[PDB]
Amino acid sequence: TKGILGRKIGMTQVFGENGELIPVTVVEAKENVVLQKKTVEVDGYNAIQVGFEDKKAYKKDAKSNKYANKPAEGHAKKADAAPKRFIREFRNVDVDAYEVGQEVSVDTFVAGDVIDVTGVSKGKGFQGAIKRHGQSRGPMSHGSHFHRAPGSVGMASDASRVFKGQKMPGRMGGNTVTVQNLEVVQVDTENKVILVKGNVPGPKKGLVEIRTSIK
Amino acid sequence: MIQQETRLKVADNSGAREVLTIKVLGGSGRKTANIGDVIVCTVKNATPGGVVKKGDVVKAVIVRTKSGVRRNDGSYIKFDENACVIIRDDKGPRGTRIFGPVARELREGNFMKIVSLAPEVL
Amino acid sequence: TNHKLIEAVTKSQLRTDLPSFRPGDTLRVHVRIIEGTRERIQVFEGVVIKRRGGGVSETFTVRKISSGVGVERTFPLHTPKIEKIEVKRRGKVRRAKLYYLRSLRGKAA
Amino acid sequence: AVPKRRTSKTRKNKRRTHFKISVPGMTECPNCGEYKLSHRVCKNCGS
Amino acid sequence: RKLGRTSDQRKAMLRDLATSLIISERIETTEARAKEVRSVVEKLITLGKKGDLASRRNAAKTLRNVEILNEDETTQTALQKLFGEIAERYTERQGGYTRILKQGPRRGDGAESVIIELV
RNA sequence: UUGGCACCUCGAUGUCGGCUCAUCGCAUCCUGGGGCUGUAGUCGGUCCCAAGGGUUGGGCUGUUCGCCCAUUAAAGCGGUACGCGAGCUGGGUUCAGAACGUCGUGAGACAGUUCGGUCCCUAUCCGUCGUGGGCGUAGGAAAUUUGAGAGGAGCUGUCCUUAGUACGAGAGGACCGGGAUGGACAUACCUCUGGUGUACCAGUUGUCGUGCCAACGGCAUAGCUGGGUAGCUAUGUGUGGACGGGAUAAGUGCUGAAAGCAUCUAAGCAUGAAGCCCCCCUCAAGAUGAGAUUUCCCAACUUCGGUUAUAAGAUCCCUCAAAGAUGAUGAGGUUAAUAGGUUCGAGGUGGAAGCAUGGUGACAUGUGGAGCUGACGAAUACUAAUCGAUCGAAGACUUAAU
Ligand SMILES: [Mg+2]
Ligand SMILES: [Mg+2]
Ligand SMILES: [Mg+2]
Ligand SMILES: [Mg+2]
Ligand SMILES: [Mg+2]
Ligand SMILES: [Mg+2]
Ligand SMILES: [Mg+2]
Ligand SMILES: [Mg+2]
Ligand SMILES: [Mg+2]
Ligand SMILES: [Mg+2]
Ligand SMILES: [Mg+2]
After folding, report:
1. Which GO biological-process labels does this protein carry (chain B)?
2. Which domain holds residue B34?
3. Where on strand F do bases come within 7 A of a protein Cβ?
4. Residue range of the domain that includes A64
5. Distance in angstroms (rounded) separating the CA atoms of residues C19 and C16
6. Residue among A170, A162, A164 at smallest CA distance from A127
7. What's the total number of domains in chain A?
């Protein structure tokens, strides 16, 4: 419900009530003007897609991607707002309301509405065995030349294969992950940020979509 | 933390002076400990006299471990000595005159005969 | 400064009128607690060992011997649970942090 | 740690097919009569 | 922060490369020195724009105690050079910001040589 | 398991235990569901259906096995070349030395002990874990996506309320529903707690050098100790395991003849489990059965031989990084804040040098929370991202609705 699309900037602590300290991730949630929505009448899933931070004008000589293009020009002219950089589905909520071309708000929530968080990982390059998966290393002394490699992979020749799904050294990777049931300690309106509880994925100046919980 | 085979200058007036922990009893595969748990332990040193004698497996609460404890406001209590109190298996000590200032955290776990029998409690 | 907008959320909770000092001083920190039928309030003498990491996340800690044991306690100094800080005595130290107190007669003067 | 088979004259040529070299930028100077490499300065060019 | 080989060299080689920059005013070398020596000799000649005795001592933290000169048939000791003929030249706002210009590779290697120029 | 047979291997198929890593049966150890008890309750015996998940730390010996200590909800039985040495140790067994008992007149012998004994290899192809180029997807491109499928996760204790009530004289003491926080495990992240922090800051030791004193370099593991920002992490901080559905297995049932009564069943109708599917999260249209919505671009030679030469949109090439083995992913390329510099600030260190005062000095004190700063934040075009090139569409037939 009301999937805002903020980005992080860091993490600090905020003293709650009587003595309680709770660590807080501060999520900068800039402008979010709703682009076209799609329903069951058109082709079959009721959803609201949302934009995020804008960029400059269109079609001069696009060296970068902070300039738009004739695809995203007419796709964003339809709602008569500036062209965008991050467009995300929300098939969670509310096919009825949310008129097209509406800024959403920042205060859809209250200080106590539980949320979820979807964001990409850090990604730590190509890393090996006992750092990626929870495997334990070998003995570092008494003569053993088996310090840190993964062990055996399969049996002898009554299974002449190695079974796929084997947890071998590959890339650590940034793939998506969703924590569940975080809460909001405080909402700001004027500086246009919110806060959450604990810590969410996705390193600084990243991207994170948040939405209501499913408890 | 205090784990499998630590050695603890016990604080009671009941004859033991140093004990060593066999197991940190709790859940299955329990490894670590901190203030308020209960460990089973066998004495090594023994004061002449006292109550208990050398080589007698007794159960004993933990008090004031070396690393801190995080109470829920943001404080920390780091002591400077691992210590212990031998319990009677009714959550009360053996002797009377336990030394060595005690952390407040062992109160929800109904150890309140130790706290009233003690010097300065934080 | 940290950013343009960390403190814009956070300056409205930062605490005023805590008399600024340096590691080497001798403090008498009061603090309000609760236990049962009490909101009783307790003093705690000691010497500042270190002071760290300014902003809303700033931290100091104090050290006091109690009965032969060195009790070391740490606070986040902007908490609304500390009541009153005195400064009993100024200090003459050279190092900023003071981890070398594992001795038995330090006597910082 | 040895081969078990001599690789034939198909998986020799099929393997080395991603082993090439491409031309570089090659933008010409205005008055050199000589092609500099892009974002560089020659010794005897209009660069 | 880039590197060359190792921690003892990477100071005492790299400080002995800005010295040859001072007495010659243009040199050619490979990339990861010249991308990196850009931000040491330029940070050094902010001390030209101050030029007091407390800045004179810290200029002796980096440059050699060495490389006498002879351009006026007389000896400028290469610490007296930059405070009279370099700091006087530059009064633009960003210190003594120097340019680089890249060239082709070399024969026996594939490093891109680059003339830096103290302008 | 102990064997029997000699079928493959002697132009070598490495052999016991243990560490590393699993994967599979159920004849089930715990947890879930029942029948039956010579089951008062709490406990317990025995049997049926059930593999979804769990299955401990130490002493002893090479050990397997075994006994013993302290726990736990439990410390299951097995297969996988008695799983795993082109992944590892070598303690024993099966190498030369030596000795003891013993048998042999002798050389020597022993499933009898006993001390010491070299463990080789750079990955061709399949199989894996990641990760890119070409082409297909009847015009080209961008963005967002549906989800056939496939992976992931599934564990539990203790305390309190019902209540000291039902049963039971008394000892003790709930089923069934609600409330708390723990354990182990799987994740995400550095604000706090700590660790590291090799171009940061301060003290000091030898010796050499900058003509000398003061200052400061070089070398000695980074010469050594105290501390420390970013980045990376746990022993640190949060979060997690679902609630809810549909058919059943064991079992319990209602109606009901065969076989006038009974009878759960033969035709119908129920209910019934951590089990199966949908639900939770992750991947996924190369799912050639190649899906879906929105948006942008449309011409002359010319017997479409399309010769071309371009748009949309990319890219070559450069300054780096929230990304990173290269390639790939992002952020930018003068209409510019992408790096470096300059300025200010946070954080760190702890009061610079000179000069003055006091001390015969060693050094104290002011000038002054100073000086000095690598990764983080903001401002500014001062230097460098120039001028250019390369690739890239002009939409077949069939019948049908019009
Ligand atoms: Mg057999
Ligand atoms: Mg025969
Ligand atoms: Mg033969
Ligand atoms: Mg052979
Ligand atoms: Mg062999
Ligand atoms: Mg069965
Ligand atoms: Mg199993
Ligand atoms: Mg022993
Ligand atoms: Mg004889
Ligand atoms: Mg000398
Ligand atoms: Mg500007």
Report:
1. translation
2. 1-122
3. 19-23, 55-58, 69-75, 80-81, 83-90, 121-125, 127-132, 141-147, 151-152, 157, 182-194, 198-199, 209-210, 215-220, 222-223, 226-228, 231-233, 235-242, 280-283, 292-297, 312-314, 316-320, 322-325, 330-335, 340-343, 345-354, 369, 371-375, 377-378, 380, 382-389
4. 1-215
5. 9
6. A170
7. 1
